């Protein structure tokens, strides 16, 4: 069996490794347009580790073409094209193509994040623009605040990390950052950028702002030129796959940032470019290369980070995006002093559930205490179809010096349950 994987990153390396365990005999090739793979960027595994695991790393080769019916792909190394055949093809190409509707976005003064590899332009900057307040955006605001720069943040949605939190859950986080030369512009889109000799002017749907330079923190898209046209694609240009991560054509699969994941209990498609989706989809394709053995469970955009002094975690549907779903969403917020027997710092928890079915659909957490791991529990609760009643009584552990009497996770479900009984 010849398993060929295009993309030697999180998704691809996971698929490679997972494939090696399933098929100890199979010939496995990992292809990538880079000099070396194995490290995080802007060193979790060594080429020797892939090698010890009988995985051929064909680097410096950029895939440029495909032939689905003859089952071949073509890469271009040292100016010379070369075709390669496959029995199974796994697309783990990620998303790095910069595609915007911003006029004059090709300014060298507008840094495109992932390509980051601090930098002269930023150090010589006093005021910097950040386009996008998603996870990538907040990371940039963080490093810019450390460098003591003035920051202008542009976000089309209502609040910071909009796809993960509802306004009230991060209102304090924003104020916190506002006291640190961070200036927010929500519900404002960057329409164009004028390059001056010593800076840039962001032309938004509301005004013009001056900055010395800018960081593009919006989600990039999959560079899928090499893609065979017979392969079904989604409107947003991601590759369409079924619950087994197979493309619309025989012997070709796609994982990670290539595809659009699904939040099943609410059967809706969305693009969640996260490391956990990359690792999970990769480990799973490996068991569906010949037979539809294990359905991908889907994604809930589960995330956890730290913005300043605040630990923030999120998973599932936000109440805000509930306007676009059939479920009648309801929510409750719980405040409970941190685990040292309710004496510690406040922990804010929001739970989103279906008001009719009482199924848990989303959760948000904000605190100065690092309780982030609880998001993995809340995520599991939603992913297994629990109701307020189930969450309310799930097992949890108590220890007078380590926890509170009743876990905030269980309490979130109970509080919602009680409120639903008037």
Residue 309 annotated as lining a ligand binding site? no
Q: Three-state DSSP class for 310?
A: strand
Site for Na ion in 301-340 (CB under 5 A): 322, 325
397 scored as a contact of its own copies (CB under 8 A): yes
325 binds, among Na ion, its own copies, ligand FAD, none (CB under 5 to 8 A by kind): Na ion
Question: For residue 412, which phi and psi values (nearest 5 degrees)?
Answer: -60, -40
Residue 226 annotated as lining a ligand binding site? no
Residue 37 or 330 with smaller CB distance to ligand FAD: 37
Yes or no: say if 175 and 160 are a contact pair by the CB < 8 Å rule.
Answer: no
Q: Three-state DSSP class for 361?
A: strand
Question: For residue 202, which phi and psi values (nearest 5 degrees)?
Answer: -85, 120
On the 0-12 / 13-18 / 19+ scale of CB atoms within 10 A, 382 is buried
Q: What is the DSSP letter of 240?
A: P
Report how far apart, in Å, the C-alpha atoms of 29 and of each of 36, 39, 54, 274, 418 are.
15, 18, 9, 24, 55
Tell me, residue by residue from 33 to 72, as one string, x for binding to its own copies by CB under 8 A and - for no binding. -------x-x-x----------------------------
Angle value at C-alpha 277, between 235 and 99, nearest 5 degrees: 40
386 scored as a contact of its own copies (CB under 8 A): yes
Site for its own copies in 260-299 (CB under 8 A): 274-276, 279-280, 283-284, 294, 296-297, 299
How far is 385 from 298, CA to CA, in rounded Å? 13
8 binds, among ligand FAD, Na ion, its own copies, none (CB under 5 to 8 A by kind): ligand FAD
Residue 68 annotated as lining a ligand binding site? no
Residue 170 or 371 with smaller CB distance to its own copies: 371
108 binds, among its own copies, Na ion, ligand FAD, none (CB under 5 to 8 A by kind): none
On the 0-12 / 13-18 / 19+ scale of CB atoms within 10 A, 208 is exposed
Residue 422 annotated as lining a ligand binding site? no
Q: How far is the CB of 273 from ligand FAD (least distance, A)?
A: 4
How many separate helices (H) and strands (E) can be counted in the chain?
9, 23
* Residue positions forming the annotated binding site for FAD: 9-11, 32, 63, 93, 95, 114, 257, 275, 398
Contacting positions for its own copies (CB under 8 A):
10, 14, 21-22, 40, 42, 44, 274-276, 279-280, 283-284, 294, 296-297, 299-300, 302-306, 313, 315, 341-342, 370-377, 379-381, 383-384, 386, 389-390, 392-403, 405-407, 409-410, 414, 418, 421-422
């Amino acid at each position: 069996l010849k398993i060929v994987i295009i993309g030697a990153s999180f998704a691809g390396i996971s698929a490679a490794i997972a494939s090696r365990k399933k098929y100890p005999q199979a010939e496995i090739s990992l292809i990538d347009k880079q000099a070396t793979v194995g490290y995080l960027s802007g060193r979790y595994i060594t080429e020797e580790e892939l090698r010890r695991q009988k995985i051929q790393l064909l680097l410096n080769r950029e895939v440029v073409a495909m032939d689905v019916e003859n089952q071949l792909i073509a890469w271009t190394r040292k100016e010379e094209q070369q075709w390669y055949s496959y029995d199974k093809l796994i697309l783990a190409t990620g998303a790095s193509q910069f595609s915007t509707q911003i006029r004059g976005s090709q300014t060298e003064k507008l840094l495109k994040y992932k390509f980051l590899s601090a930098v002269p332009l930023l150090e010589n900057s006093q005021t910097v623009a950040v386009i996008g307040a998603g996870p990538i955006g907040m990371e940039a605001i963080d490093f810019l605040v450390k460098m003591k720069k003035t920051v202008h943040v542009f976000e089309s949605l209502e609040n910071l990390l909009p796809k993960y939190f509802d306004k009230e859950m991060v209102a304090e986080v924003q104020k916190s950052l506002e006291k640190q030369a961070v200036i927010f512009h929500f519900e404002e889109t960057v329409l164009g950028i004028e390059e001056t000799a010593n800076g840039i002017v962001l032309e938004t749907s509301e005004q013009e702002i001056s900055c010395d330079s800018g960081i593009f923190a919006l989600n990039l898209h999959p560079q899928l030129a090499y893609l065979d046209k017979k392969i079904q694609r989604n409107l947003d240009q991601t590759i369409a796959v079924d619950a087994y991560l197979q493309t619309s054509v025989p012997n070709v699969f796609a994982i990670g940032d290539c595809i659009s994941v699904m939040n099943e209990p609410v059967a809706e498609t969305f693009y969640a470019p996260l490391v956990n989706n990359a690792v999970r989809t990769g480990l799973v394709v490996a068991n569906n290369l010949e037979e539809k053995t294990h359905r991908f469970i889907g994604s809930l955009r589960t995330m956890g980070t730290k913005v300043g002094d605040y630990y923030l975690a999120s998973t599932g549907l936000t109440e805000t995006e509930g306007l676009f779903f059939p479920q009648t969403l309801a929510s409750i917020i719980v405040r409970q002093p941190a685990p040292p027997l309710q004496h510690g710092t406040e922990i804010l928890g929001k739970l989103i559930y279906d008001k009719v079915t009482q199924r848990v659909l989303g959760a948000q957490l904000c605190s100065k205490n690092n309780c982030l791991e609880k998001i993995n529990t809340l995520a599991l609760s939603i992913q297994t179809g629990q109701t307020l009643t189930d969450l309310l009584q799930k097992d949890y552990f108590y220890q007078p010096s380590l926890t509170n009497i009743y876990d905030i996770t269980n309490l979130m479900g109970a509080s919602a349950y009680w409120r639903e009984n008037d």
